[PDB]
C-alpha cells in the first residue's frame, strides 16, 4: 500500500532476530512525511527485510533529524517493537551523542526545560514552560578556541531536543541551519579551519552510543558508531587551532 519498498543501502551494525541497529548518514529522512513522501529509512526497511510490514510502523521507535549521523535501533517484530516502545517510554534506553557548540564553554551540566513548537517559526521548537518535559544532560569532552565539543545522553527525546535546548543556552551546534546562525571563525583561524567551517552544512550532532536491555533476551547490548569523516575534520581542525593558539614554546 501507501509507502513503497525503496532500494536505499542501510549501514547495519548489528542485526538478530529481532532487532537492527543501524548508523544513519546525513541527508536522509527517518519516517515520510510533508516534503518527504519517500526515499526515507522506512523505505529502505521495506525493501531490505518486507516482513518489518507487518510491524507498525516498519519497526521505528525513535528518530533521528535528516541531517543528524547515527545510531537508532528498530524492532523487525512485533513483540520487539512493543517491548522496544516501553523501554523508551521508561527512559532506559541510554542515547549518547557527540556534538560541536558554538562558542566557549565552561562547565558540563543539564538543561531540564520544556519543549514545543515555536508558535511563529514553524520550522522551530522552543524552550517554554508548558511545552513537553525535556533533559539533556551534557559534559564537555574538549575545549577548542570559541567552539566546544560535547558529549551529550537524552534522558527524554523530543523533536530537536539536543539542538533546541544548546540553542537556549546560549551554545547552538555549529551548522544547525536553524538555531544556528553564520559561522564565526576565530581571530587568526587558518585558512583550512576558515573553509572547513564555513563549508559544515548540518548541525554537528552524531548519535554516538546506544545501549539497551535486549527487548526478547533481556541482555544488556551496547553500540556505537564511529564519528563521521566530516566531523572528523571539523574537530581536528579546530584542535589544530587551539593547540596552535596555546601560549606554549615551539621547541626546534
Known sequence: ??????????????????????NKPRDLVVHPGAGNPDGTVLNALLHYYPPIADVPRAGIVHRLDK???????????????????????????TREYEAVAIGHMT????????????????????????GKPAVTHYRIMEHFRVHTRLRLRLETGRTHQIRVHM??????????????????????????????????????????????????????MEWH???????????EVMRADFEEHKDEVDWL
Open 1 to 22: 500500500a501507501r509507502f513503497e519498498p525503496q532500494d536505499i543501502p542501510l549501514d547495519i551494525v548489528y542485526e538478530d532476530e529481532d532487532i537492527i541497529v543501524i
Open 67 to 93: 541531517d543528524t549521523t547515527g545510531l537508532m535501533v528498530v524492532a523487525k517484530t512485533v513483540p520487539a517493537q512493543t517491548r522496544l516502545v516501553e523501554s523508551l517510554q521508561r527512559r532506559e534506553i
Open 107 to 130: 562547565a558540563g551540566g543539564t538543561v531540564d526545560e520544556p519543549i514545543s513548537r515555536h508558535p511563529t517559526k514553524r520550522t522551530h521548537m522552543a524552550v517554554h514552560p508548558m
Open 167 to 220: 540553542a537556549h543556552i546560549t551554545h547552538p551546534l555549529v551548522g544547525d541551519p536553524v538555531y544556528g546562525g553564520r559561522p564565526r571563525p576565530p581571530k587568526g583561524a587558518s585558512e583550512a579551519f576558515i573553509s572547513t567551517l564555513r563549508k559544515f552544512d548540518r548541525q554537528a550532532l552524531h548519535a554516538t552510543m546506544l545501549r539497551l536491555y535486549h527487548p526478547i533476551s533481556g541482555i544488556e
Open 225 to 235: 558508531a564511529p564519528i563521521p569523516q566530516d566531523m572528523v575534520e571539523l574537530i
